[PDB]
Amino acid sequence: AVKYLSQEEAQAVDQELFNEYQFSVDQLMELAGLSCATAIAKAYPPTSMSKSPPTVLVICGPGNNGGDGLVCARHLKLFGYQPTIYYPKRPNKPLFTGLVTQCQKMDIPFLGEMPPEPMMVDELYELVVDAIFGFSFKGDVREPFHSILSVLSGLTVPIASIDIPSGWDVEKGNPSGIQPDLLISLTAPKKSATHFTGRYHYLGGRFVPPALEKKYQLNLPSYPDTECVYRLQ
Amino acid sequence: AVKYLSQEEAQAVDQELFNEYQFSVDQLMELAGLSCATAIAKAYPPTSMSKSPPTVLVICGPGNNGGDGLVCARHLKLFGYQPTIYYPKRPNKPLFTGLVTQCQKMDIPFLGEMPPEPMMVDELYELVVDAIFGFSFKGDVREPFHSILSVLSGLTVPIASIDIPSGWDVEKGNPSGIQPDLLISLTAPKKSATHFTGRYHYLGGRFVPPALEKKYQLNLPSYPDTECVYRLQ
Ligand SMILES: Cc1c[nH]c(=O)[nH]c1=O
Ligand SMILES: Cc1c[nH]c(=O)[nH]c1=O
């Protein structure tokens, strides 16, 4: 049975990865983003969708979860989805400026505003990716994300969350928060994951050294062959 | 029919990727390395091998092909191979120091010398990955790579080459050079690829924007589902 990580633990593992093992931030994010794009394509394959190419809104927050979202948007386009991104708060750091340019030149469009009504999102986007807040959230949630989350909580189309459903307390969840259909837990699941009631839970981020998985007793499942995702439960 | 690129063309496409599209070097290398690890696992799956875990020597050169090799070693270990690396000439740049530490802490060992006789390599390593020179080679080939290539040309176990078989002229090949069993062409094949006579030719590096594939008329095949490799011919 895979370990579900405290916020303490998750912070520690993440910090080993960057300092002790010296993975660069972009390397880990590229693998995370790919895992996400991959989970989405397995859960919601293109052939199984009414639109062709199937359309997807990726909503990216102001830190690393946002960046996973950018990577994810990009691999989705390659897997034959048609993504659109909303990215309202963009850290001005080469990592993020690069990701934005990549998507831009992939003709992945960045909206200037969130569609203000649940219905409009529903009509335009067959699936929505919540790439807003991640495991290091505390929060608490400022604008424009409060009003964004609030639009999301009224959607009828599925939500895919990266790592944590944004708006949820990282260990305790949130009974009134958003309720996604797919959760991609990166590295290993966080304790908020026990409150998850969607259909698809996937593990992603196939880059965890054995020595580290042992040290924290993560008990990761065996990813099949060369896959970067594993369907849990 | 996929385009086979001149060295001119390949240099140009590569430079669009980094300048115009602003992919960072590590992002592209992580995807390349993964493609390689993946081609190897599909061509030589673990179950199909006499040793368990199956063993692999990754020989890494002094530039980017070397770095793809480091990434590749690492994903191989994750896919259940047991790799060993020989990396004699290491650029002292954070990118490469990071890759070395990652592998080190994965318990992937870096040999201090090349086993000097073809037979010793054969007895220890079921497969050898040629991660030495890449598409920007001119060369010409200095030590210790000359004596290395020379050891390789006497092997009985298969060779997997990344992008180009090292020692070959990038467009014209090399009749007396090494003769690999697997070639992983990254991005798109180079003209040396027409001289390839091994069994496995895979395309890798699933990150080519449509606008760029169109501008250079690469005519890439369709990668299946969420795969990062495609078997050619
Ligand atoms: C440990 C860790 C690293 N990176 C993530 O995105 N999530 C995690 O839980
Ligand atoms: C265009 C190009 C980029 N990167 C590579 O490794 N090989 C290539 O041919």
Q: Which residue has 């990955």 as its token pair?
A: B129
Contact A227, A202 (CB under 8 A): no
CB contact under 8 A, B24 and A26: yes
- Backbone dihedral angles phi then psi of residue B213, each to the nearest 5 degrees: -50, -40
Task: Give dist(CA B226, CA A78) in Å, integer.
Answer: 9
Q: How big is the A-B interface in CB pairs under 8 Å?
A: 75
Nearest CA to ligand 1 atom 2: A14
Task: Give dist(CA B26, CA B99) in Å, integer.
Answer: 10
Ligand 2 pocket list (CB less than 6 A): B 10, 13-14, 32, 134-135, 163, 186-187
Q: With helix as H, strand as E and coil as C, how does chain A read?
A: CCCCECHHHHHHHHHHHHHHCCCCHHHHHHHHHHHHHHHHHHHCCHHHCCCCCCEEEEEECCCHHHHHHHHHHHHHHHCCCEEEEECCCCCCCHHHHHHHHHHHHCCCCECCCCCCCHHHHHHHCCEEEEECCCCCCCCCCCCCHHHHHHHHCCCCCCEEEECCCCCCECCCECCCCCCCCEEEEECCCEHHHHHCCCCEEEEECCCCCHHHHHHCCCCCCCCCCCCCEEECC
Comparing alpha-carbon positions, the chain A residue that sits nearest to B17 is A102
Which residues on chain A are in Cβ contact (under 8 Å) with B27? 26-27, 30
Q: Is A67 assigned to a binding site?
A: yes
Q: How were these coordinates obtained?
A: X-ray
Select from A23, A30, A107 the Cβ nearest to the Cβ of B102: A23
Note if the bond before A140 is cis, omega within 30 degrees: yes
Both tokens of A80, joined, read 């034959």
From the CA of A21, the nearest ligand is: 1
Domains of chain A as residue ranges with CATH: 1-233 (3.40.50.10260)
Residues β-bridged to residue A230? A203
CB contact under 8 A, B22 and A209: no
Task: Give dist(CA B164, CA B159) in Å, integer.
Answer: 12
Distance from CA of A47 to the nearest CA of B (A): 10
Atom from ligand 1 closest to the CA of residue A32: 6
CB contact under 8 A, B106 and A211: yes
Name residue B175's amino acid.
P
Contacts of residue A130, Cβ cutoff 8 Å, sequence gap at least 6: A59, A152, A159, A160, A161, A162, A165, A166, A178, A180
CB contact under 8 A, A225 and B41: yes
From the CA of B4, the nearest ligand is: 2
Contact B97, B68 (CB under 8 A): no
Atom from ligand 1 closest to the CA of residue A11: 1
- Backbone dihedral angles phi then psi of residue A107, each to the nearest 5 degrees: 65, 30
Contact B148, B61 (CB under 8 A): no
Please give the distance, rounded to the nearest whole angstrom, from the Cα atom of residue A41 to the centre of ligand 2: 27
- Backbone dihedral angles phi then psi of residue A113, each to the nearest 5 degrees: -145, 155
CB contact under 8 A, A27 and B23: no
Q: What angle in degrees, to the nearest 10, is found between the helix axes of A25-43 and B25-43?
A: 50
- Backbone dihedral angles phi then psi of residue A51, each to the nearest 5 degrees: -80, 155
Comparing alpha-carbon positions, the chain B residue that sits nearest to A39 is B226
Select from B21, B26, B41 the Cβ nearest to the Cβ of A24: B26
